[PDB]
Amino acid sequence: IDGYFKIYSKHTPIIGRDFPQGFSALEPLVDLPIGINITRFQTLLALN
Amino acid sequence: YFPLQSYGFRPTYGVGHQPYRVVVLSFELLHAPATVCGPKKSTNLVKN
Numbered sequence A: 001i002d003g004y005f006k007i008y009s010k011h012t013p014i015i016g017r018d019f020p021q022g023f024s025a026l027e028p029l030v031d032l033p034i035g036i037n038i039t040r041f042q043t044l045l046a047l048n
Numbered sequence B: 001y002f003p004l005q006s007y008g009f010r011p012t013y014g015v016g017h018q019p020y021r022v023v024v025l026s027f028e029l030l031h032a033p034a035t036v037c038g039p040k041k042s043t044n045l046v047k048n
């Protein structure tokens, strides 16, 4: 938003198997004043 | 002719011929979120 990259995050235990039904707001972690275009993104994996 | 020429600074030289260190500070225009400012804080809390 307007030149700022904002990252909100939340760590929740999994009481069940996958994607529990519940509500929990995401607190803001990080704000960066980078001010450049973002249009594509990808995740990172590593092999042991 | 060689584009570069040695200064050959000497202490006995005059003020005009003496070496002088020059630093230029150039300020970037406001195109990205501002990341440089000055120290600006004072005063106490004084409650009630």
Ligand SMILES: *[C@@H]1O[C@H](CO)[C@@H](O)[C@H](O)[C@H]1NC(C)=O
Binding pocket: A037, A039
């Ligand atoms: C980058 O963002 C600017 C500002 O919104 C826009 O004018 C420009 O077209 C964008 N460039 C690309 C390659 O998406």
